[PDB]
Design a protein around this ligand. Structure first.
Ligand code: CHO
Length: 305
């Protein structure tokens, strides 16, 4: 018994799952070869036995959020405000901690539309919409600071508690969901990253949980693909079940009929592969969900989808 607690997945349909890389619901399953791209997200990362990796944390509304205090407005561009960051749970940020950036920090390049809000000790408040540019030279969260931009040029206070609530993309300039920010700015390498992931057996492709996030203007499918839904990460953190091999065989199952629709490989380091080819969404019955079947090895041959 000891050291062999059985592994399980939560009982949740696709309409009951959340994206772990942007704070919205899952819309569909998706597969693609992503030919030539390095897939290395830092949010939504966990081992199957419950160790969170990268910048991953547990609270859904802290995904892509920021907290801190504004120490100064930029003198020659009053749309820009210097935010000195804390952790999203309110504790001070320790740059010496062995993570790439404060937990929850965005893990992709974009102009992110959102709202900057404040509440003073006397309960006077203000909030203004604007943009967090994760590609900016001044996006240096691992050093403790980022720049916020707003249309408002006067009505934000210095040295008062501040939060950034993300909403979506402002436009598509610089948007690339697989391009990591430089968390310490220009000429400095990222540290303590969760590793890139790829299929390791011929005929297989990654399977993603995909959301189409809001866009304020332009043309885009707004796709944000995560490797594990947030609820699976929360489940593994609680359960802490050991992994006896490299790969768990899982099956998408109708719970009323028992019919198994397809099977997939769930890898120890926290991602899914399927036997499939091409770029396509995957339509599943609204009532089904993945169930654990058995433990196998990296070279197990899946039935084709
Ligand atoms: C401060 C950042 C990043 C600028 C930057 O680092 N540029 C490169 C460089 O300086 O080297 C910029 C990028 C997009 C900008 C925003 C967008 O252009 C939209 C909008 C435009 C308005 O005229 C001013 C407010 C507002 C909301 C801009 C504020 C400043 C932002 C948020």
């Amino acid at each position: 018994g000891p050291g062999s607690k059985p592994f399980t997945l939560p009982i949740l349909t696709i309409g009951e799952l959340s994206n772990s890389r942007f704070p919205v619901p899952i819309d569909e399953l998706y597969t693609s070869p992503n030919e030539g791209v390095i897939v290395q997200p830092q949010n939504g990362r966990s081992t199957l036995d419950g160790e969170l990796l990268g910048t991953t944390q547990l609270v859904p509304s802290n995904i892509c959020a920021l907290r801190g205090r504004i120490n100064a407005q930029v003198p020659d561009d009053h749309h820009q405000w210097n935010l000195q960051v804390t952790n999203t749970n309110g504790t001070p940020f320790d740059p010496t901690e062995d993570v790439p950036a404060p937990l929850g920090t965005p893990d992709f390049l974009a102009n992110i539309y959102g709202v900057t809000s404040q509440r003073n000790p006397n309960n006077t408040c203000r909030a203004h919409d604007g943009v967090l540019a994760t590609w900016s030279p001044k996006f240096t969260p691992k050093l403790g600071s980022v720049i916020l931009g707003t249309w408002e040029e006067s009505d934000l206070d210095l040295n008062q508690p501040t939060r950034f609530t993300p909403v979506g993309l402002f436009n598509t300039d610089h948007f690339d969901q697989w391009a990591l920010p430089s968390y310490s700015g220009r000429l400095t390498l990222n540290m303590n990253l969760a590793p890139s992931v790829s299929p390791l057996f011929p005929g297989e492709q990654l399977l993603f949980f995909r959301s189409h996030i809001p866009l304020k203007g332009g043309t885009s499918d707004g796709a944000i693909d995560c490797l594990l839904p947030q609820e699976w990460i929360q489940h593994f953190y609680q359960e802490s079940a050991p992994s006896p091999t490299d790969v768990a065989l899982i099956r998408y199952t109708n719970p009323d009929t028992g019919r198994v629709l397809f099977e997939a490989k769930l890898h120890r380091q926290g991602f899914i592969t399927v036997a499939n080819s091409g770029s396509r969404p995957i339509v599943v019955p609204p009532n089904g969900y993945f169930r654990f079947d058995s433990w196998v090895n990296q070279f197990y041959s899946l039935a084709p989808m």
